[model samples]
Target: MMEQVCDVFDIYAICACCKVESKNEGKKNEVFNNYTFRGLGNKGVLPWKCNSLDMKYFCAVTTYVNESKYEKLKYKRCKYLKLQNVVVMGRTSWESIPKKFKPLSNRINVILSRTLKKEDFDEDVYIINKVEDLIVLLGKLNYYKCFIIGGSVVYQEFLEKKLIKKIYFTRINSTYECDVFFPEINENEYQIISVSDVYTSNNTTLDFIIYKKTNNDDEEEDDFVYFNFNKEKEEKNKNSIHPNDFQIYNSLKYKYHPEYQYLNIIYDIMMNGNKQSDRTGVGVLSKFGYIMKFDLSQYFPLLTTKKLFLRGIIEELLWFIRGETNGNTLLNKNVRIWEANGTREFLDNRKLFHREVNDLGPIYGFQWRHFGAEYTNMYDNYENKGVDQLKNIINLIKNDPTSRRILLCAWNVKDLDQMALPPCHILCQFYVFDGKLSCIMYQRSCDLGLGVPFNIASYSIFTHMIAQVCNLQPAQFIHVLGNAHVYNNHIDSLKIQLNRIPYPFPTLKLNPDIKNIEDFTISDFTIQNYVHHEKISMDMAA
Candidate 1:
């Protein structure tokens, strides 16, 4: 089919009609972006269907430069300045563009091709064979801005040379089967300033996002120094005359949870988060400062994306409440979640030879029970040892529920060097209001694929247990995340998980007979109506 015409016409607007193609040439796929077909111009096109909104966006952005401003740009280098903005493209891109729409309207078309000659095209179109030529021409031509409108080769060269500054990327939701792929951007060197919501047309779903280089060394140094000095004189300016292309064009619609907002959080990270290296040796797509609220009165906060082992989470929470740091405590119940990091060899690897096998030192439970106690081997039983924060916390909840001082912290700075592993869920605070109990937990590191579901279940259950003893109804469990990330290896598995519709949040039932938090056991809790999707399998990043 020929392309459908858009209601708002630009003549070259190809929304849903862009065709996909491929090739294998003289070079390997590594050297060339895609393999070329042996014949027919050896040509290529967009690997996915083009969205009309994105097409109009492309033209508006590239062609909006003023012609009047360029009339005054008649210096020694640019005596005849015709176009204010330049669109740099490769030979394939130039040839694939409709012949009549050849030198894309209103912009100075700079084509990069070693094989193509200058005389073959009109005098109006600029031809550059090398990276050095693009550099010299752009420097001398005096344009408003340079847009690297691409083919694989053009993008590869410009990116490798670090010539491009910002990227206006269209992130499609579904993967297309095509040999031509975009080069990976350096996440460490760039950050997303703005992103649009998922817009749909036919079967396509996508977001328009922008990324700018992190380093700002290219800004006028003298002007920057003057700005800083005047600020040293005690003030700052709001907006400068320079263009702010980081302006947001569109935005997200809210979806309240007790639903799939947690799923939505993960989805946002997958589409727009910064990809960076992490301590696990596996890379991650990381987003900072996320808040997820689960109203405990409505439903249990445990995720229904994939079936979680409710048994393991219950056992771990009970173990921690008892202030037992031994991994063997849970291991005895066939829960080896901590076994990977607790083996004697692993402990010794962390330089904790003083500790016995499976004895996780002064970890979550120990810190909860005994905050400042000096550590010995896990065998030595110290009754009435350190300050009992948990007991005091209980008393405060019963006696002075309104006090803001009821914060429990597991991050003892003095004990970090002594433990086999540091705590990830480091601190939490409780709130008592309107006969309801709520908890706000702060986790320093969150493994989105594996640990998050467990964390949610554990804390939700813990909050229930706390409320069970405090004589209050469970209200909310607000999870505050610091470094929320999806391990690179788990990316594909998570995408599969996202496709499945979420089941209703299950019910959490705690035994009404158990009044004391310490008296609660795995048998005391029940997670009913779980009705989860098939459990996803991803390796735990220890």
Candidate 2:
């Protein structure tokens, strides 16, 4: 079919017809032959005659005829005729079409008259009458680009409705005064995006130009829900350990408890009403004895039932121990958790700052890695009053069996005054049970969407590291989240993610050669056995 059409000419003159009278009168054929096809020929263009040998080109009419001679002629021409016939149809009104020309009951491709519906055309159809219906359909289709052929009303409707992207017009000099004229397309409202030329029979040139509606101030509006992690919301999940409303945990509670007593400590930490103070700290002693005592494979490092950010936690933990304070380090690894800490242009435009911390004080990584003890020297003040200070705590955990002094302070009260942000979950302690080691961290605030995932993985990896250094079995990583409320904006996204079946927890493989804690680099950490059902997007709260 295409070969026969191509043989006629480089471009075929396709007459566009709408009503029954137009087809029967041959107005469209006359217009093309006398105007378009002949116009090109008079200007030294080849093929003055329409014939099979001269490469046939038929100007088809789209008029609806009942059982008229024209209908039979068109079907026969379309069926077996050698001419390259192209049908041009228009949808004017039901009255304009003859009764017999109306589409048969079962015929789908027949010419008819009706306004286009959302489902009648592919999603690429840009013109729609309603807004809510349009939004719903747009979500389903996500159309990239679409073009609407000429209809003065359709073009004007698109202009007023803000649906048209580009308007293409072919201007002919000869104009007839008609009852209806295409509305004046304001040139100032549109920019000429593209243009081409066509020659007329009188050797005059016609411009085929495409103009794009330019509205730089236009803001894209959508009904899609967004989650703001920072806003205060009612804590409905007070008794729930997991964030989701649905019960995701199994009855097999034995997985977390028997091997690691830290689960009890975690429950206790949550039960404790005392707000995080300089002295307040959570500690856990594992029932499973020290190194090589229990099956490490049985106890997966992560809390399985809870929605957690396993990867962010792992990366952040690795970043901290690696003593990296710069956001660029994590950014290079494709982690943007710390991107909003400073005056970053891209992040500011996106409104991605988490908490007002950058405006207030410094975070954990900044204090731990860069300026350790700038306010109160942990090295000089090793012998403190309340608890055995950080220096002696490490030694106590290693040598003393029944010592309550294995402490690490995160919040520096003296430093907090000078800090750009106040610290949360400032202190942690290590406990040696039978022989295994466990860690408990206090988080001041938690963004269930963004922070929780990182928190879980961070401390879990920390547990792995501390266990390796102490020569004890890797035990539990207990997290006490303060103000653990899901951000309201994140509701829809959370729903989508909550529906996903979590991937199998990946394993953290630390290099065996690196014995010293300080010697471990970014390369020392390798993740394996990772699996997840879907990728979810959760924007960080400002």
Candidate 3:
């Protein structure tokens, strides 16, 4: 049963999407119908009890889709080329799954309930009440498989209707203090096959079984016709896959310019953010959990909606890379952006009166170059004093690029009190795929009017530089914001910037000849074709 059924199902994964799939696509509409998945639940929990191999096998069965069959079909210019499986479940069954695992990965989750609403869940979740809605979802979306993941209520409702033609029942061989159970299988119209070895772990064992509906000439044809979202009653029976439906829902058709997102956030905060007062004494219109992404392969994400002072953004990043804590160095280069923060009065207010003026204690640069190094004055040449994080990340990228552990952090909890300011762009994680480097940075605090625009380009430059040295293309930069707000004073200016149309983004050219990050300087960067609107009136409300 073990290997034999594995062969049967690997072949089955092929035919769900297969079953002469290309021939049907060439003819009329189509869909695979009515597959059910049953599991062992012990009082609203799984009974396997760390029997990992048995359950891991379950995921393998559920996740498996016939990939070789899919590529041979060679879906033409489809909106999405990748594949995923779908899971349909009841509301209580959805709730029984823990919040941390609320979103079962690589599977589109659909919930059916009279009471549940789409707004209650994230956009990824499809909430529907009827079997017809399930048909519509599968019809429009291209997927490998659609599964009915069950509790008794959902299984009973679906089963009695005979809407479910096949079931994946894992009969638990061990007993528990159970309340809920897999609904009794009907032997009249369905056939069961033991699909796996009666696997065991700890003291428990479970057998995997496949149940399929028998005798269905009218049923199969009706199921095929009903999986139509864009159907006119009689036309539905002839409709299966609508290429037109797939095109309209395709996200690529509506993609926006990257800077438009930043500008849109400005509008979102203005229209939606509530007036709130914070530590800096400046009142702001604030919102939380905003995100912005830029494709480094396309162009440098310098905000094209308004003219940015590109010099200061680049210099500040270079300053951080050099691990210089003194703001006087930036001021020497005629960049006054950090001048106010490093002022003697500001340092004294932070209770760092003992530090020299223009010294921003162990800030971002210090942490990047010398994390955990003992902080003296900004003047100390602390060579080889602490972990050289920036240098080490370069090595990490070059040597073990696939490691998820490749990260850089500036949020030092122990050193926060001594710093001129806590870090805003707190941490960054780099991911490598196909010889391209992508970064996702978490910013704990974001100033939408002033800081965010600068941070975007600054990190864009940083990501480009790293990818340059590592011989990888800079792919994407994602900024996740904890707090995104517009200072009350800058609302009008922000609005003015938002109303202006954005120009095409400029290309950022790094001197490819310079390989080492240390060898790079201010002269190594060139901003090409930087067309932008006139700058607006706004000052940093530091």
lDDT, residue 23, model 2? 32
Q: How much does each candidate deviate from the true structure in C-alpha RMSD?
A: 17.1, 26.0, 23.7
Off by over 4 Å in 3: 1-255, 539-542
Reference-based TM-score, model 1: 0.54
Q: lDDT of model 3 at residue 535?
A: 68
lDDT of predicted model 1: 0.67
Error of 1 at 209 (Å): 30
Q: Where is model 1 more than 4 Å wrong at Cα?
A: 1-259, 539-542
Tens-place lDDT digits, model 3, residues 1-542: 22221112211210110011133243122221112112345566654445555556546766777877765332521322267777888787788887897778777788888898778788998888786666556656656666777656766666666666566655443334334545556666665432333333444333354566654398888888778756644422123222343231121222255676787687667666767878889798778998888877756777766777788878888898899998999999999988888888998899888888899999999999999899998999989998888998889999998887888999998899998989988999999999999999999889999889898988989999999999999998999998998887886576566554443456778888989888778889987545466666676343
Clashes of each: 5, 21, 2
Q: Each candidate: what lDDT?
A: 0.67, 0.40, 0.69
In candidate 2 the C-alpha lDDT for residue 483 amounts to: 50
Better of 1 and 2 by lDDT: 1
Estimate TM-scores for all models.
0.54, 0.39, 0.53
Q: Quick one: RMSD of model 3?
A: 23.7
